[PDB]
Amino acid sequence: GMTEYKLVVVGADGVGKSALTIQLIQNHFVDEYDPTIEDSYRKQVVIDGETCLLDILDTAGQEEYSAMRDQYMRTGEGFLCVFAINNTKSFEDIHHYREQIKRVKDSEDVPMVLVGNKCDLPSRTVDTKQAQDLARSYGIPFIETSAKTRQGVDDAFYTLVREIRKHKE
Numbered sequence: 001g002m003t004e005y006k007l008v009v010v011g012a013d014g015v016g017k018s019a020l021t022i023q024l025i026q027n028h029f030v031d032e033y034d035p036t037i038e039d040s041y042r043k044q045v046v047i048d049g050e051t052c053l054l055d056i057l058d059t060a061g062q063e064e065y066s067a068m069r070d071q072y073m074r075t076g077e078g079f080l081c082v083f084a085i086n087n088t089k090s091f092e093d094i095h096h097y098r099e100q101i102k103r104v105k106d107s108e109d110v111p112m113v114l115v116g117n118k119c120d121l122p123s124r125t126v127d128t129k130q131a132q133d134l135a136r137s138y139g140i141p142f143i144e145t146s147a148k149t150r151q152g153v154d155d156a157f158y159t160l161v162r163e164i165r166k167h168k169e
């Protein structure tokens with residue numbers, strides 16, 4: 001029938017987590033989506049021939065380490081770690097997010113994809129090589145995306161799904 005996959009999109013404010021989600025769910029580019037709104041969206045898609053129900057959590061709110069957020073977050077089976085290629089700070093923050101995932105899953109190997117969004121922008125302060133290097137040090141895939149032009153968006157989420165399959169073996 002279906003396989004459900006619980007995905008969680010994380011990373012710093014403004015990198016495009018909402019835009020990426022809404023682009024996948026609803027196929028349009030949201031210009032100014034309330035930065036404080038956290039919610040889950042569900043989507044039925046076929047990926048490599050398998051009909052999937054993607055439960056996607058788009059994180060937002062205040063920074064804080066509360067027990068039910070911990071429990072909200074550890075239901076994730078796979079994590080999109082998103083930075084913007086024009087936001088150096090958001091790239092440097094990726095390690096903190098991967099540490100928070102590792103802690104709440106209590107595991108050293110959690111399915112994860114590194115995503116460099118806003119790749120449609122000319123102002124590029126994070127190189128591709130810098131991000132690939134980080135991705136290879138985690139053993140995880142890296143993809144560049146643009147929620148505005150939709151390039152790479154579907155691939156980034158399906159690639160994560162694929163990482164969840166391999167983890168399951």
Ligand SMILES: Cc1cccc2cccc(N3CCc4c(nc(OC[C@@H]5CCCN5C)nc4N4[C@@H]5CC[C@H]4CNC5)C3)c12
Pocket residue numbers: 010011012013059060061062063064065066069070073074093096097100101104
């Ligand atoms: C993201 C995440 C993944 C897995 C488990 C988690 C468990 C608890 C909490 C988390 N999350 C909550 C939001 C957040 C978080 N960590 C930051 O780190 C910002 C800077 C970087 C270095 C430390 N810190 C000073 N920021 C968060 N916020 C998001 C993005 C900005 C901020 C406010 N709006 C939404 C942590 C878990």
Ligand SMILES: Nc1nc2c(ncn2[C@@H]2O[C@H](COP(=O)(O)OP(=O)(O)O)[C@@H](O)[C@H]2O)c(=O)[nH]1
Pocket residue numbers: 012013014015016017018019020030031032033034035117118119120121145146147148149
């Ligand atoms: N040029 C460009 N702008 C983007 C892209 N993705 C998001 N944005 C814009 O960046 C801002 C923050 O996006 P949002 O999805 O709210 O980021 P979030 O805080 O991670 O949810 C919004 O103004 C978006 O229109 C992109 O791929 N390219």
Ligand SMILES: [Mg+2]
Pocket residue numbers: 017018019033034035036037058059060
């Ligand atoms: Mg948002």
